[PDB]
Design a protein around this ligand. Structure first.
Ligand SMILES: *[C@@H]1O[C@H](CO)[C@@H](O)[C@H](O)[C@H]1NC(C)=O
Ligand SMILES: *[C@@H]1O[C@H](CO)[C@@H](O)[C@H](O)[C@H]1NC(C)=O
Ligand SMILES: *[C@@H]1O[C@H](CO)[C@@H](O)[C@H](O)[C@H]1NC(C)=O
Ligand SMILES: *[C@@H]1O[C@H](CO)[C@@H](O)[C@H](O)[C@H]1NC(C)=O
Ligand SMILES: *[C@@H]1O[C@H](CO)[C@@H](O)[C@H](O)[C@H]1NC(C)=O
Ligand SMILES: *[C@@H]1O[C@H](CO)[C@@H](O)[C@H](O)[C@H]1NC(C)=O
Ligand SMILES: *[C@@H]1O[C@H](CO)[C@@H](O)[C@H](O)[C@H]1NC(C)=O
Ligand SMILES: *[C@@H]1O[C@H](CO)[C@@H](O)[C@H](O)[C@H]1NC(C)=O
Lengths: 49, 299, 246, 50, 49
């Protein structure tokens, strides 16, 4: 039960925004100017780490 | 707390403080000719932009404010107020004339006609951009037609790439055969400049300054006096803009003639080459350590 | 005039074409680099020219090797159409100087030198800006060169080594050191080779050509600061394991 | 207030209609407007002080 | 072996950028305007912590 719960929580954590405009990298890449996309990607990277 | 029990405690660290300061700069006496770049009374078209190389001179950027009536700088890798301290290897100056509403396209990671067909900047650009209005010089009542820009191109340009070829752009399967017929165009349009347009449609003069960081011996930087060289003492040092503190000693390392710096595992500088005398020096941190206090109870 | 014929063969590069990636001193460390390198154990073309479409592709970069001594080889040409409608490079060497120009040359099918007029190379050049003059590059011996361009910057590396009597490329490691970086800022697709012909007279030459690719390398620095060993991380599983374990 | 729907939008021509200096966008970037696809567009216009 | 590896990893970690323009404090201080240098110093501080 503990192992399954931990893995499920880890998977569920991928849908958080962490202060960015979206939780999907493709949307950020397709909607934002390239030098302005790093400030949004960094938040997601830090949260997932 | 105001009371201490019996034991041994770790409080702080001791360090030796620097005594003086050392500045070492190369032998440069000339003055960089920024005046010739500005007021050239003739600016090239955007599709064929001029490029000038500046090297082996002393650069005083504060005088640039007296040459053109611009409002402010726009720098990306550095700050305008710190330009008088850094020392570079080469400087590049590009100049051209564009429209008012295209000035936002001269920036890293931009898209548009000028960005992808005329002038492209790298995504890791380090430099400054200056632009100012030139309506009183580049406008005519009938309409100026000496400034041109490219409209059609097969593929997007690469950073710092220029195109000069004049041909007939083909938009169909049949060959153009050198005639501007159907599906065949001339890829060079001309700005129509009049003094009665709005601010967004008036001509603007643009100068881009590009800098090169220290990888080779430096050649361009500002007027900083150079002091003597002291050794075997804890001192502040400044070698070509690289600042630090420590002890400078003789070096037994065998630097290759094209090398200028030495790094360690932590990727910090530990060997340097003197700009004036081609001599290798080693840098070590000044003495330091930790202090512990042993006491019985304050009672 | 067309008076040159060429023949081709294939051979193995072993482990050649390593250069210092930066002008930074290091010693007794293992470093990881990502750059354009010549892959280990790759095809390299052996060209024999005797007296022809020597407009070979440039691709990302070029590795050139020559084991001759008669100094019959000198200079190179770079471009995308080799015509007067586009600018092109004119690197030319002689016994005293090297001259590099970027103009719109009207090149010939088979360019060479009369020996000493370039009238057989290009008909004329009219519009250009970039010119440069310096000390010539070329100075039982093997000469290795690397040419590339990134972000409008043309970079050249070179090395000269002594070689014994051998019919193939040697075994071992020999690093290359940078010489020249220039602000080229043009489009390069094809390149060319130049030879000098005395008057004409029969001539023979041979050289090795290879192409660079983006690769990751693990280099080893000895206590004196020289590169003595390298590992290519995309050659076989063992090399990948070595790179991962550092 | 005007509603825009069921059409192909080419924003790069807007620069030829008014002598403005630059866009001011919040959720997107001006240079990426030619790739995104929306459901409806609304345009509001008025006159104010400087 | 474990102690040596941990200490070596800790030392090696000092050469990361963590999204800043450089991993050397002196370069940031000498190249940047003083109120603009904090946004770069903070990233390094957080990564090292
Ligand atoms: C140089 O630029 C200044 C700008 O104030 C101008 O007044 C001056 O006439 C110019 N000189 C020349 C020779 O163009
Ligand atoms: C360079 O030349 C090649 C050869 O025709 C061409 O395909 C390409 O579009 C040109 N431009 C760039 C940026 O590669
Ligand atoms: C720099 O100038 C000083 C004094 O004129 C001289 O002693 C020194 O040799 C010079 N160094 C170089 C590299 O020119
Ligand atoms: C070189 O290429 C040929 C075919 O072009 C191939 O058979 C051979 O394995 C390659 N490598 C060599 C000869 O080392
Ligand atoms: C080599 O070429 C340069 C450039 O044209 C020329 O000045 C020089 O005289 C040439 N060398 C000889 C030995 O003629
Ligand atoms: C330079 O370019 C112009 C315009 O493309 C052309 O008319 C001229 O013939 C070229 N050569 C010279 C020497 O002006
Ligand atoms: C390193 O350099 C020293 C001094 O020249 C020399 O004695 C020694 O043999 C060198 N060692 C290697 C491995 O190159
Ligand atoms: C449309 O706007 C342009 C702006 O340049 C103006 O010149 C033109 O007269 C306008 N047309 C109408 C019908 O209002």
């Amino acid at each position: 039960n503990h192992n399954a719960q931990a893995l499920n929580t880890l998977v569920k954590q991928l849908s958080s925004k962490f202060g960015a405009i979206s939780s999907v990298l493709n949307d950020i890449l397709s909607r934002l100017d390239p030098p302005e996309a790093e400030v949004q990607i960094d938040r997601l990277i830090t949260g997932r780490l | 707390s105001f009371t201490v029990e019996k034991g041994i405690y770790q409080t702080s660290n001791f360090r030796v403080q620097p005594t003086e300061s050392i500045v070492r700069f190369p032998n440069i006496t000339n003055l960089c000719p920024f005046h010739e770049v500005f007021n050239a009374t003739t600016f090239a078209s955007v599709y064929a932009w001029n490029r000038k190389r500046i090297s082996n001179c002393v650069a005083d950027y504060s005088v640039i404010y007296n040459f053109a009536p611009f409002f402010a700088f726009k720098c990306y890798g550095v700050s305008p107020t710190k330009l008088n301290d850094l020392c570079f290897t080469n400087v590049y100056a590009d100049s051209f004339v564009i429209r008012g509403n295209e000035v936002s396209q001269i920036a890293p990671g931009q898209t548009g006609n000028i960005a992808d067909y005329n002038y492209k900047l790298p995504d890791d650009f380090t430099g400054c951009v200056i632009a100012w209005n030139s309506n009183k010089l580049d406008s005519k009542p009938s309409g100026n037609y000496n400034y041109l820009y490219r409209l059609f191109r097969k593929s997007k340009l690469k950073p710092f790439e220029r195109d000069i070829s004049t041909e007939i752009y083909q938009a169909g399967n049949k060959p153009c055969n050198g005639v501007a017929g159907s599906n065949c165009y001339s890829p060079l349009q001309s700005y129509g400049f009049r003094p009665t347009y709005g601010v967004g449609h008036q001509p603007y003069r643009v100068v881009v300054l590009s800098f090169e960081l220290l990888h080779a011996p430096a050649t361009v930087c500002g007027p900083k006096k150079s002091t003597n060289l002291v050794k075997n003492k804890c001192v502040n040092f400044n070698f070509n803009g690289l600042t630090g503190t420590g002890v400078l000693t003789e070096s037994n390392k065998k630097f290759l003639p094209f090398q200028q710096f030495g790094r360690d595992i932590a990727d910090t500088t530990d060997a340097v080459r003197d700009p004036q005398t081609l001599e290798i020096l080693d840098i070590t941190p000044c003495s330091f350590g930790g202090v512990s206090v042993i006491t019985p109870g304050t009672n | 005039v067309n008076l040159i014929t060429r023949t081709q063969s294939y051979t193995n590069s072993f482990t050649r074409g390593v250069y210092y990636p930066d002008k930074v001193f290091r010693s007794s460390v293992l470093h990881s680099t990502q750059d354009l390198f010549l892959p280990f154990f790759s095809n390299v073309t052996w060209f024999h020219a005797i007296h022809d479409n020597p407009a070979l592709p440039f691709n990302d970069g070029v590795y050139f090797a020559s084991t001759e001594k008669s100094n019959i080889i000198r200079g190179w040409i770079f471009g995308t159409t080799l015509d007067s409608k586009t600018q092109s490079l004119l690197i030319v060497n002689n016994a005293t100087n090297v001259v590099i120009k970027v103009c719109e040359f009207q090149f010939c099918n088979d360019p060479f030198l009369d020996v000493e007029s370039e009238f057989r190379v290009y008909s004329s050049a009219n519009n250009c800006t970039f010119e440069y003059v310096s000390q010539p590059f070329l100075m039982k011996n093997l000469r290795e060169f690397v040419f590339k361009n990134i972000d409008g910057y043309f970079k050249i590396y070179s090395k000269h080594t002594p070689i014994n009597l051998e019919r193939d490329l040697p075994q071992g490691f020999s690093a290359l050191e940078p010489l020249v970086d220039l602000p080229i800022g043009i489009n390069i697709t094809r390149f060319q080779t130049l030879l000098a012909l005395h008057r004409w007279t029969a001539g023979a030459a041979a050289y090795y050509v290879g192409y660079l690719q983006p690769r990751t390398f693990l280099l080893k620095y000895n206590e004196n600061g020289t590169i003595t060993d390298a590992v290519d991380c995309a050659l076989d599983p063992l090399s990948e394991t070595k790179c991962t374990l550092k």
